[PDB]
Design a protein around this nucleic acid. Structure first.
Length: 271
RNA sequence: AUAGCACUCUGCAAACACGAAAGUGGACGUAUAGGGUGUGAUGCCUGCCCGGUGCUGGAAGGUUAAUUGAUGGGGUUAGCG
């Protein structure tokens, strides 16, 4: 959707339109308060730069574990969620309990979902990787038994199931990494909704300020006391790029963990 | 500074940051996400060079630390003179 250039700040605005989303208030029992941080920790110092401001938001309690095995549920509606890029679906169980889940692509009001070993192979059903059919597209992949989904949760995300060896399943992630998972962990059929999410163009600086991003100052624009890039008469770089704390920014690898290196077989390539 | 563009790092107990540690932010987020760097709507575009410094990947050839202690040479005295 294009906006007409009636003002200079509207010339380059792109929006994604979805007419099936619910327009009313969210489901009250599943909503709680959430505060802004400003990127400051309990010492009160800034630990993440460029964070502050933005619109007030409530947190929606999303069920990532899907431990209500055996009971079918029906989708009531699809909702916008300010905490994430994907849409959410309100579920209605056969015994009156209501929960939120991440909405798979194509799920509409009136569809049926469930979880467990005996669930059918339909988008939105939650089954163990040992029971998943080989070659399927999955999302919401769990890493620790019972902890819940952690991988491939954003809009348009999906992973590919490739094979099953020993007690481990082989998956390919959307970053290009190829990895092992325990076969007992769960996953969900399908790929995540709102796949047009990356087509939007903000159009102006205020749009970023609404989402809570403060401006970025280049290190080249500072003094020597503030940044290794600071200083000089006129414009000049004269240095191999580094972070404000001296760490190289172009190609230098930073992974350190040695505990989980066995679970990665084929790295995405240029890690 | 900016919307837009590009490179690069990060598979989640994430990279990164604060702190002596416990711990906290990143985020009650999960590669369409998060950090760093440069450029700066849009239109047409963005040539040659990897010798130097850096980064990434190999090699098991040469050099090299703590550790180990084979050999060789001294000091001393039983005794022989």
């Amino acid at each position: 959707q294009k906006c007409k250039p009636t003002s200079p700040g509207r010339r380059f605005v792109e929006k994604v339109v979805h007419d099936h989303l619910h327009k009313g208030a969210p489901y009250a029992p599943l909503v709680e308060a959430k505060k802004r941080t400003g990127g400051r920790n309990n010492n009160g110092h800034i630990t993440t730069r460029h964070v502050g401001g933005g619109h007030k938001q409530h947190y929606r309690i999303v069920d990532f574990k899907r431990n209500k095995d055996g009971v079918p549920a029906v989708v009531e509606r699809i909702e916008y969620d300010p905490n994430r890029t994907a849409h959410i679906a309100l579920l209605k169980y056969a015994d009156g309990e209501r929960r939120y889940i991440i909405a798979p692509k194509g799920l509409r009001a009136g569809d049926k979902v469930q979880s467990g070993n005996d669930a059918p192979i339909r988008p939105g059903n939650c089954l163990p990787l040992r029971n998943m059919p080989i070659g399927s597209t999955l999302h919401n992949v769990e890493l620790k038994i019972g902890k819940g989904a952690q991988l491939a949760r954003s809009a348009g995300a999906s992973v590919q199931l490739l094979g099953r060896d020993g007690s481990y399943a082989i998956i390919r992630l959307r970053s290009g990494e190829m990895r092992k998972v325990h076969v007992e962990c769960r996953a969900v059929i399908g790929e995540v909704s709102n796949q047009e999410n990356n087509l939007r163009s903000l159009g102006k600086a205020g749009a970023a300020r609404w989402r809570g991003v403060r401006p970025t100052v280049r290190g080249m624009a500072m003094n020597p006391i503030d940044h290794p890039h600071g200083g000089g008469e006129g414009r000049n770089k004269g240095i191999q790029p580094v972070s404000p704390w001296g760490q190289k920014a172009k190609g230098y690898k930073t992974r350190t963990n040695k505990r989980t290196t066995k679970m990665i077989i084929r790295d995405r390539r240029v890690k």
